Amino acid sequence: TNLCPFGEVFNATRFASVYAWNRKRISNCVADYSVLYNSASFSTFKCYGVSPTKLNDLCFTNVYADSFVIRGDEVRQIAPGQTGNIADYNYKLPDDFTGCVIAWNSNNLDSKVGGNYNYLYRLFRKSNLKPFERDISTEIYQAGSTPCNGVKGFNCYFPLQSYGFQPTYGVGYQPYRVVVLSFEAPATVCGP
């Protein structure tokens, strides 16, 4: 009978960097997904394998709400079957994804004159992430045959890059807050 704590996710003051994406497990509660879809405060609300309207009539064992910040031109990568810096090295959705991807412009909260250096992404990785894999490692990347031993230099690079969000950037370089709802024993979360 309790409402699902969606407000803690969508209205959080701080969001995580994509490399260190947050996951909120939703359990034992009731959820109005049409209320979310009816806010219309979203530039992206794409549902895969389900209908936003029919979500209010379904039940699931576990709902996950993943949350992070990326740039506008990278929102397209938050979808099944996609490739790119985010999908390959930061946040990967499965090809059979059953859930919803919601995004909104956050230039008013996440950008700063002089640059916000708090939001980062992984630029350097040897291999692709598996679906729902989180890599928070900060080890020096070896681009050559010589081991780096924690020392930056030729062929030895820090793996993370700041987005440096500035308000004067175009929409593609501007910050976007993203919430991925994943719908998965007994059901615990249901709609009305």
Epitope: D88, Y89, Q142, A143
Partner: antibody, heavy 116, light 108 residues
């Protein structure tokens, strides 16, 4: 540290050609790697890119015709070029891309001529 | 997609003077992905500047870069004869794009 391109030559329109780039001092499979070409008397044109993790991307002018790949045990990058056209005539360079640090390592290039 | 327009197409100067080469992006973009290359006649391109303002390894002090948003600048502070060449700016959005090149020629 060097990249050495091989395989350039004369090909008929509609033909195919595989370019190779043998690296030393970087590991191809650990890097963003590009092919960049330069038609005679023209400017630089990015052609194709491969990520360390295998994702590939192509310029619209060569999409569906060119395939970038690599052989880790030979530390070598390839460009397979099919359905070649006269406008593909150029010097083809391989380059290692550091994205935020630029393309720091460039090969001297290999010349491709497409003509009837 | 980002389109880079360099200006002027040809710059005509004398040894010892200061050169100012411009690169205009069609949208406001991040400076961390802006690079400049030199191509001397017959040779491959050579990285001069990365991240808009950082000099690459072994590049002489007279080369410097600056700018932000849509307007980026390469400045060569005291031209030497070997500096007369073609210069390309480059941006990395989701893949590399190049400007069309500025020729630096000797004035007479």
């Amino acid at each position: 540290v060097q990249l050495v391109e091989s395989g350039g030559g004369l090909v008929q329109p509609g033909g195919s050609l595989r370019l190779s780039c043998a690296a030393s001092g970087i590991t191809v499979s650990s890097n963003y790697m590009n092919w960049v070409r330069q038609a005679p008397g023209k400017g630089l044109e990015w052609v194709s890119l491969i990520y360390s993790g295998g994702s590939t991307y192509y310029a619209d002018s060569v999409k569906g015709r060119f395939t970038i790949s690599r052989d880790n045990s030979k530390n070598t990058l390839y460009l397979q070029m099919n359905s070649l056209r006269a406008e593909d005539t150029a010097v083809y360079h391989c380059a290692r891309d550091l994205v935020v640090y630029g393309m720091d390592v460039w090969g001297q290039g290999t010349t491709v001529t497409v003509s009837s | 997609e980002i389109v880079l327009t360099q200006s002027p197409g040809t710059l005509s100067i004398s040894p010892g003077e200061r050169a100012t080469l411009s690169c205009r992006a069609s949208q406001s973009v991040s400076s961390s992905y802006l690079a400049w290359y030199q191509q001397k006649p017959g040779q491959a391109p050579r990285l001069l500047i990365y991240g808009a303002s950082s000099r690459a390894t072994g590049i002489p002090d007279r080369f410097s870069g600056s700018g932000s948003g849509t307007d980026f600048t390469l400045t060569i502070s005291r031209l030497e004869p070997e500096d007369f060449a073609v210069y390309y700016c480059q941006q990395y959005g989701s893949s590399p794009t190049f400007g069309q090149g500025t020729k630096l020629e000797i004035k007479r």
